Design a protein around this motif. Sequence first.
Motif, PDB file in Angstrom:
ATOM      1  N   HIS A  31       0.728  -0.940  -0.268  1.00 28.81           N
ATOM      2  CA  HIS A  31      -0.383  -0.094   0.423  1.00 28.81           C
ATOM      3  C   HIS A  31       0.754   1.194   0.558  1.00 28.81           C
ATOM      4  CE1 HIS A  31      -3.363   2.710   0.781  1.00 28.81           C
ATOM      5  NE2 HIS A  31      -2.571   2.791   0.896  1.00 28.81           N
ATOM      6  N   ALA A  49      -5.102   7.478   6.058  1.00 34.33           N
ATOM      7  CA  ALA A  49      -5.668   5.435   6.086  1.00 34.33           C
ATOM      8  C   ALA A  49      -6.456   5.146   7.034  1.00 34.33           C
ATOM      9  CB  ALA A  49      -4.862   5.088   5.096  1.00 34.33           C
ATOM     10  N   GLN A  69      -9.526  -2.831  -0.031  1.00 33.62           N
ATOM     11  CA  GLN A  69     -10.076  -1.621  -0.216  1.00 33.62           C
ATOM     12  C   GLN A  69      -9.224  -1.167  -1.798  1.00 33.62           C
ATOM     13  OE1 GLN A  69     -10.696   0.531   3.587  1.00 33.62           O
ATOM     14  NE2 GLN A  69      -8.922   1.174   2.369  1.00 33.62           N
TER      15      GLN A  69
HETATM   16 CL   LIG Z   1      -6.414   5.140   1.707  1.00 32.03          CL
END
Ligand SMILES: [Cl-]
Length: 162
Positions: A31, A49, A69
């Motif tokens: 990420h 986040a 996500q």
């Molecule tokens: Cl995010």
Amino acid sequence: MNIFEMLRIDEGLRLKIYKDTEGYYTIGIGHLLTKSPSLNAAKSELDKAIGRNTNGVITKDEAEKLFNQDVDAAVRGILRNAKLKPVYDSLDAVRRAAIINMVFQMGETGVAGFTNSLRMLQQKRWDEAAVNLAKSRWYNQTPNRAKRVITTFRTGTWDAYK
Ligand SMILES: [Cl-]
Ligand SMILES: [Cl-]
């Protein structure tokens, strides 16, 4: 094998902020946090986040949540993209995973930029597309991962990952 297990093999899992192959601040399963050089700018994005004060560290569950996500956004971005959608629509299930992998790593803009290869994938010219995909900075920078993705496009099986 599926998209999730494929990307988990390519990206690994890290619970503390780290620097990716390009030197950017990352966490979890690939990420990206920020391209900024500031570790503080990275911690800030991280807390934003996760919705909590993390002090640069997260749990497995939190990592998995970011990962769910990101794959979702990756798929939805492809389907909204005028250049990508047609390619995706034309491919079988294994090859669809390969293009999702590229998008997750390099973003929609980046992949959409592989004009010639996309045209070859759409026409189902596997060997030719594999050769053209290799003439890229992507392949030169992360050759082991690029080879795996490329083989997936060439063969349409999960062999490179087994
Ligand atoms: Cl995010
Ligand atoms: Cl690599």
